[PDB]
């Protein structure tokens, strides 16, 4: 059976020193967690789990669990992983790289530095979180009240506004963009409202 | 064949203890019924139906019955459901979670606590009460006579109007927005009518 | 056998004084004719939420107004035609010369709008649009307001209402802006 | 959307013709087919089933699905390709009864190529005479129409949808004439 | 087995003098090559109304020009390529260095128009569009009239006609108004 | 059932000598692999698979498996193929011509010379490198920040900008064109923003 998104673990003791450069060659975009060394282990006596890396590997096309497993073996050594699980929520796995996800936070796992995350081949978690249809409607309606409230005259004035106070309403630039897309028509109405409204004084 | 809204049953004896956290990961918003243990069963002798949970699972994009069924198997165990039905009225299935829907009320099913409902990933039933198609047409036609009558010159003057006298015609802001969406073209005609009418 | 649209008759002498408020409760949208005394009875246009039977209605109304208020529930085939029949203003009734009533006495329970029941053939849409054209051409109507104002008056003559233009021009909006610019820049010539 | 069925005069009321009118659906009814019954061309408002019609007519007076509306309209008079080669008894097209404003013409939709062909004519026409907007175009068609094979109601069906494209032509023409 | 497009050869010594008028009667649109003497024969591009067989053609022509006029009816796979072959101006014939003929000697029976037979690929549309772009950019063409005028003249050089631009820009109209506003406000500078 | 992209095999012993010129006539763009003679064969004893060619044949319009099979039979002989498969990933099948694809590389198949690939009728594997859909959204969002940052006023000022600094953001002209297509609506908003923003001095 086939899918695009996988994760597996890389073990420092059975991967070459140029491993980080070697994953880069696969051409596939990857995100690699900070070195997960301080994982509380549930074996008796021993303090932390063997030291490991978590990798978020997104294939170009829909491929199988094993096509990856052997693509990585023949690239880092037959002994580097064995356990390739298929990833169901890319956003969630990316947050898991730092134990900062919903699953991991409720399991109180040892939170890592998101700055240690390594992005091979231009991973940007941003290109993997599109939004629920309802969400789109919800945000759009916020964009409305926003253009209303501050009498934003045009999509530049809107962007400038989001640039600053963005987070407060939970918009970014690249987000408004995905929100207003297709509703453009409706936008020109708002922006004319605002224009001819500010022309009143 | 494909759709966005589904329901299926989760059985407590064949789902992990962290099942509730696990469904959270799917990223998909779900609403999960209170534990349906007191369902009158129609098998002879036995009192209540095997104890189960009802799930209302709304996919991000139009997907198939089976893409769900296996997404959940590989997430909870091959044995947790087998029966994924496609939901036709999201509001009604949400009311069915507590046996508080029209179907269930007339079947006299054992009413549950709506407080036991579990919302995974920010389900809000409020945002799937989209309008009957007719309603949209009806309301638009009101928005028309409204822009006509008060010579509202542009969507701001329209909003400002709704802000006040909204309820009287049964509009809110967020409601106009859902009404006029798509008919935007038609709007600019109304708002030019109005503009050039007041210029007279 | 099942259907959504029915009509029956209500008799004033065997229905309670709060009958009009009681029908409201059924939750079903209804249109009730003006008092049909100069044919004493009422005609009711009752459209069920879901496909239900002749008798599920007959008894829902008996247990709501008294066992003696109707007995005769017919199933309606053309909702628009039965709505016109409430005022004897339909094709059937007009040729039978029946006593025309005031459409202002029609009573709409639970937000009946006969409009939400008259959609139109696709050809019809094209046909009417083409009328709307010749209409904007002929009287050099400069914009949808001048169009509406026009329909408001002489509407019936071409068979338009406001709410009908709306359903006609919908989608063809593009095409409209061309007509309305024509008209505009045409009148700017004088 | 499109059906036909047969109405038998001995098992339909005397006001049958007025009763079909009420259904609100446009129908074309053949001349009385006695020299082979009535043939009915019934076009539903929306896509409906064989049986929703059969019972709608039963509960109204006491059904094959049509594939080519124009061909079934010609069959009402035995004047179609199928019937002419079967030498069937040709009837008077004047006995055809149009309920609720049937116009077989509203099913003379264009070959798709035709639409493209005509549009391209509408182009060269707006170019050549520098027609500035759809009124100037129409006025033009009104007179010289036949010469290019246009009517008003035909441009209308042609330009429909390509309206965008039109605004480009009409702005060309406008800013072209603004030149002197 | 059946197909719409065929070609065959007509020999002047075993076809009547009114042959050209006789093919006209078949009702089928044909294109006939210039007299191929310097390869004496004619090449015919015969497109049937409906999907018919190799032999229904071979005998329709025998019973129309004489049992001795052809025997060899091949089925045409690329109509455009066979029409180019009529003048030895096709990809096959040009690389075989065959004696190029005058395209003005081509005879079109019953309103053949090779045009109604060359539709184009989705990629082609994109390609052309991108040419129309650089064209509107380069010469600062301000609106679809100034574009047409341009194509009218220098059209063939970029491989456009009027009717072709029309099929190219169709649908992408939005995108057009942007080009034509660019051009307009560019020239206003 | 119908599709645009196919592949089949051509056998040198049952195809004419002018086969390469004959495929040219079909008018359809094809890519033909290097002569696949050194294919390890899984029949016992025998070393290489019968000698064959792989053809990547992209129809003008959506056509059926069999409309191709017979178009090729009546063009090369009834005995040249029998097996026409429908191609799912055009870029992947073009890489398979040389055994240089993901499938073939992991199966260790005998890599061929990409220089022996024959392109009939102007195949360019490139004019089917249409943008991953995500790519389109990513690029558009760049084009946005571009029009914002430099206050580009209209699609000519945009193009002029791409002409120069294009590579830096990974745009060409013909690429913007395939990016903005369809989002034209949204463009006009950006371009008005920019216009009325620069009108502010
Ligand atoms: Mn870990
Ligand atoms: Mn239950
Ligand atoms: Mn009465
Ligand atoms: Mn091979």
Q: Return the HEC string of D3-62.
A: EEEEECHHHCCCCHHHHHHHCCCCEEECCCCCCCCEEEEEECCCCCCHHHHHHHHHHHHC
Calculate how far, in angstroms, residue D158's C-alpha sits from the geometric centre of ligand 4. 52
Burial class (CB in 10 A: 0-12, 13-18, 19+), A11: middle
Distance of CA D157 to the CA centre of its chain: 12
Asked if the C-beta of F20 comes within 8 angstroms of chain E's C-beta atoms, the answer is no
Asked if the C-beta of F11 comes within 8 angstroms of chain E's C-beta atoms, the answer is no
Look up residue E186 and give its two tokens.
């560019």
A108's CB contacts (< 8 A; 6+ apart) are none
Distance, CA of C171 to CA of C132 (rounded, Å):
14
Distance, CA of F6 to CA of F72 (rounded, Å):
12
Asked if the C-beta of D168 comes within 8 angstroms of chain E's C-beta atoms, the answer is yes
Ligand nearest to the CA of B104: 2
Residues β-bridged to residue C47: C5
- Both E104 and E144 in one domain: the answer is no
Which of B56, B65, B71, B5 minimizes the C-alpha distance to A88? B71
Look up residue C6 and give its two tokens.
């029915």
Q: How many CB atoms lie within 10 A of CB F85?
A: 12
Look up residue B200 and give its two tokens.
């007279």
Distance, CA of C172 to CA of B142 (rounded, Å):
20
- Both D47 and D58 in one domain: the answer is yes
B97's CB contacts (< 8 A; 6+ apart) are B31, B32, B33, B34, B54, B56, B112, B117
Which of A139, A101, E81 minimizes the C-alpha distance to B26? A101
For residue A151, the domain's CATH number is 1.10.10.1480
Q: How was this structure determined?
A: X-ray
Decide the pairing of beta strands B30-32 and A85-86: unpaired
Asked if the C-beta of A180 comes within 8 angstroms of chain F's C-beta atoms, the answer is yes
Distance, CA of D73 to CA of D103 (rounded, Å):
10
Residues β-bridged to residue A131: none
Q: How many CB atoms lie within 10 A of CB C172?
A: 21
D165's CB contacts (< 8 A; 6+ apart) are D119, E169, E170, E173
Helix (DSSP H) and strand (DSSP E) numbers for chain B: 8, 5
Asked if the C-beta of D165 comes within 8 angstroms of chain E's C-beta atoms, the answer is yes
Distance, CA of B43 to CA of B41 (rounded, Å):
6
DSSP code of residue B132: P
Ligand 4 being an ion, which residues bring their Cβ within 5 A of it? F 36, 39
Residues β-bridged to residue A119: A31
* Phi and psi torsions of D48, nearest 5°: -120, 170
CB B146 within 8 A of CB B152: yes
Distance of CA B170 to the CA centre of its chain: 20
* Phi and psi torsions of A56, nearest 5°: -110, 110
- Both C184 and C110 in one domain: the answer is no
**Which pairs from B13-16 meet CB under 8 Å and 24+ separation?**
B13/B51, B14/B77, B14/B79, B14/B80, B15/B76, B15/B77, B15/B80, B16/B76, B16/B77
CB E105 within 8 A of CB E35: yes
| Nearest-Cα residue of chain A relative to residue F103 | A67
For residue C32, the domain's CATH number is 3.40.1310.30
Total domains in the fold of chain A: 2
- Number of C-alpha atoms within 13 angstroms, CB side, residue E109? 20
Asked if the C-beta of D177 comes within 8 angstroms of chain E's C-beta atoms, the answer is no
Q: For chains A and F, count residue pairs whose Cβ atoms are closer than 8 Å.
A: 53
Distance, CA of E132 to CA of E141 (rounded, Å):
10
End-to-end CA distance of chain F: give it in Å, rounded.
61
User: Domain ends where: E100, E122, E144?
Assistant: E122
Cα–Cα distances (Å) from F58 to C98, F38, F64, F94, F132, in that order, read 71, 26, 12, 11, 20
Residues β-bridged to residue D87: none
CB A181 within 8 A of CB F133: no
CA dihedral C65, C70, C76, C81 (to 10 degrees): -90
Distance, CA of D171 to CA of D130 (rounded, Å):
10
DSSP code of residue F116: S
CB B191 within 8 A of CB B147: yes
Distance of CA C86 to the CA centre of its chain: 10
DSSP code of residue F52: B
Look up residue F19 and give its two tokens.
């086969």
Helix (H) or strand (E) holding A5: strand A2-10
| Nearest-Cα residue of chain E relative to residue F120 | E91
Collapsed DSSP state (helix, strand, coil) of residue B55: strand
Helix (H) or strand (E) holding A102: helix A102-106
Say if C and E touch: at least 3 Cβ pairs within 8 Å: no
Place of tokens 């009417």: C128
| Nearest-Cα residue of chain E relative to residue D161 | E171
**The 3-state secondary structure of chain E, one letter per residue:** CEEEEEEEEECHHHCCCCHHHHHHHCCCCEEECCCECCCCEEEEEEEEEEEEEHHHHHHHHHHHHCCCCCCCEEECCCHHHHHHHCCCCCHHHHHCCCCCCCCCCCEEECCCCHHHHCCCCHHHHHHHHHHHHHHHHHCCCCCHHHHHHHHHHHHHHHCCCHHHHHHHHCCCHHHHHHHHHHHHHHHCC
- Both F164 and F124 in one domain: the answer is no
Cα–Cα distances (Å) from C20 to C79, C83, C155, in that order, read 21, 18, 33
Look up residue B76 and give its two tokens.
């909870």
Ligand nearest to the CA of F41: 4
Residue-range definition of the domain harbouring residue F176: 134-201
Q: For chains D and E, count residue pairs whose Cβ atoms are closer than 8 Å.
A: 41
Cα–Cα distances (Å) from E82 to A79, C115, E11, E79, in that order, read 62, 61, 18, 5
B145's CB contacts (< 8 A; 6+ apart) are C162
* Phi and psi torsions of D103, nearest 5°: -140, 110
DSSP code of residue C13: G
Look up residue D170 and give its two tokens.
């009409």
B 131-160 residues with CB below 8 A of C? 134, 137-138, 140-141, 144-145, 148
Which of F119, F141, F139, F138 minimizes the C-alpha distance to F128? F119
| Nearest-Cα residue of chain F relative to residue A152 | F193
* Phi and psi torsions of B85, nearest 5°: -95, 150
Distance, CA of E157 to CA of E163 (rounded, Å):
15
Distance, CA of A118 to CA of A30 (rounded, Å):
8
Of the candidates E95, E178, E186, the beta carbon closest to that of F188 is on: E178
**Cβ neighbours of F185 in A, within 8 Å:** 182, 184-185
User: Domain ends where: D112, D130, D156?
Assistant: D112
- Both C112 and C129 in one domain: the answer is no
Q: DSSP of F183-196, one letter per residue?
A: THHHHHHHHHHHHH
Asked if the C-beta of D15 comes within 8 angstroms of chain E's C-beta atoms, the answer is no
- Both D30 and D99 in one domain: the answer is yes
- Both E13 and E44 in one domain: the answer is yes
Place of tokens 């094709």: C91
Distance, CA of F118 to CA of F20 (rounded, Å):
9
- Both F123 and F171 in one domain: the answer is no
Q: How many CB atoms lie within 10 A of CB C159?
A: 12
Distance of CA E138 to the CA centre of its chain: 30
Ligand nearest to the CA of F93: 4
**Cβ neighbours of A194 in B, within 8 Å:** 156
Burial class (CB in 10 A: 0-12, 13-18, 19+), C99: exposed
Distance, CA of F74 to CA of F55 (rounded, Å):
17
Q: How many CB atoms lie within 10 A of CB A89?
A: 21
Distance, CA of F130 to CA of D141 (rounded, Å):
43
Residues A148, B159: C-beta atoms closer than 8 Å: yes
Q: Is D130 left (phi over 0), alpha (psi -120 to 50) or beta?
A: left
- Both D130 and D108 in one domain: the answer is no
Place of tokens 């890319």: A90
Beta sheet of D2-7, edge-to-edge order: D64-65, D2-7, D38-43, D27-29, D97-99
Residues A153, F196: C-beta atoms closer than 8 Å: yes
Place of tokens 């009814």: D29
Distance, CA of E160 to CA of C9 (rounded, Å):
72
Cα–Cα distances (Å) from D157 to C134, D109, D124, F174, in that order, read 14, 8, 18, 35
Distance, CA of A71 to CA of C162 (rounded, Å):
67
Distance, CA of E17 to CA of E14 (rounded, Å):
10
Which of E187, E173, E186, E174 minimizes the C-alpha distance to F156? E186
Beta sheet of F53-64, edge-to-edge order: F84-86, F2-10, F53-64, F30-32, F118-120
User: Domain ends where: D59, D89, D112?
Assistant: D112
| Resolution reading in Å | 3.6
In chain A, which residues are last before a break of more than 2.5 Å from C to the next N? none
Q: Using alpha carbons only, how large is chain D's radius of gyration in Å?
A: 22
Place of tokens 């500078």: E189
* Phi and psi torsions of D30, nearest 5°: -65, 165
Residues β-bridged to residue E53: E2
Handedness of CA C60, C64, C67, C70 (dihedral sign): negative
Q: How many CB atoms lie within 10 A of CB E55?
A: 9
Calculate how far, in angstroms, residue C164's C-alpha sits from the geometric centre of ligand 3. 29
Which of B3, A14, C3, C93 minimizes the C-alpha distance to D21? C93
- Both F200 and F163 in one domain: the answer is yes
Q: How many CB atoms lie within 10 A of CB D105?
A: 11
Distance, CA of F197 to CA of A157 (rounded, Å):
8
**Cβ neighbours of E180 in D, within 8 Å:** 168, 171
Look up residue B103 and give its two tokens.
């179907």
Q: How many CB atoms lie within 10 A of CB F168?
A: 8
Which of E75, E83, E5 minimizes the C-alpha distance to E43? E83
- Both A128 and A36 in one domain: the answer is yes
Distance, CA of F34 to CA of B135 (rounded, Å):
63
Look up residue A51 and give its two tokens.
């030291």
Length of chain A: 201
Residues β-bridged to residue A30: A57, A120
| Nearest-Cα residue of chain D relative to residue E116 | D113
Residue of B105, B137, B143 to mutate, testing the C interface (most C Cβ within 10 Å of its Cβ):
B137
CB C109 within 8 A of CB B158: no
Q: Which chains touch A (3 or more CB pairs under 8 A)?
A: B, F
End-to-end CA distance of chain A: give it in Å, rounded.
65
Distance, CA of C150 to CA of C147 (rounded, Å):
5
* Phi and psi torsions of A2, nearest 5°: -115, 150
* Phi and psi torsions of D34, nearest 5°: -100, -25
Calculate how far, in angstroms, residue A36's C-alpha sits from the geometric centre of ligand 1. 5
Helices (H), C9-121: 19-25, 54-65, 79-85, 91-95
B196's CB contacts (< 8 A; 6+ apart) are C142, C143, C145
- Both B74 and B88 in one domain: the answer is yes
Residues B25, A92: C-beta atoms closer than 8 Å: yes
Look up residue D115 and give its two tokens.
């639409």
DSSP code of residue B11: -
Look up residue C45 and give its two tokens.
């246009």
Q: How many CB atoms lie within 10 A of CB E138?
A: 9
Calculate how far, in angstroms, residue C92's C-alpha sits from the geometric centre of ligand 3. 12
Which of D63, D95, D65, D98 minimizes the C-alpha distance to D78? D95
Distance, CA of D60 to CA of D15 (rounded, Å):
11
Distance, CA of C40 to CA of C22 (rounded, Å):
20
Distance, CA of C40 to CA of F27 (rounded, Å):
82
Helix (H) or strand (E) holding B171: none
């Amino acid at each position: 059976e086939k899918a695009r998104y996988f994760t597996f673990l890389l073990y420092p003791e059975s991967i070459p020193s140029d491993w980080e450069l070697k994953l880069e060659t696969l051409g596939v975009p990857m995100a690699i967690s900070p070195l997960h060394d301080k994982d509380k282990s549930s074996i008796k006596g021993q303090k932390y789990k063997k030291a490991h890396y978590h990798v978020l590997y997104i294939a170009k096309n829909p491929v199988t669990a094993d096509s990856v497993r052997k693509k990585i073996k023949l690239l880092l050594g037959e002994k580097s992983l064995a356990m390739v699980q298929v990833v169901l929520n890319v956003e969630n796995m990316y947050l898991y790289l730092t134990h900062e996800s919903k699953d991991a936070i409720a399991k109180k796992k040892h939170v890592y530095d998101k700055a240690d995350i390594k992005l091979i081949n231009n991973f940007d978690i941003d290109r993997y979180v599109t939004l629920d249809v309802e969400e789109k409607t919800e945000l759009f309606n916020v964009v409305v009240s926003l253009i209303r409230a501050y009498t934003l005259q045009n999509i530049f004035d809107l962007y400038d506004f989001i640039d600053e106070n963005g987070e407060t309403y939970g918009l970014t630039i690249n987000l408004v963009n995905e929100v207003i897309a297709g509703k453009t028509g409706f936008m020109k109405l708002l922006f004319d409202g605002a224009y001819q409204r500010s022309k009143r004084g």
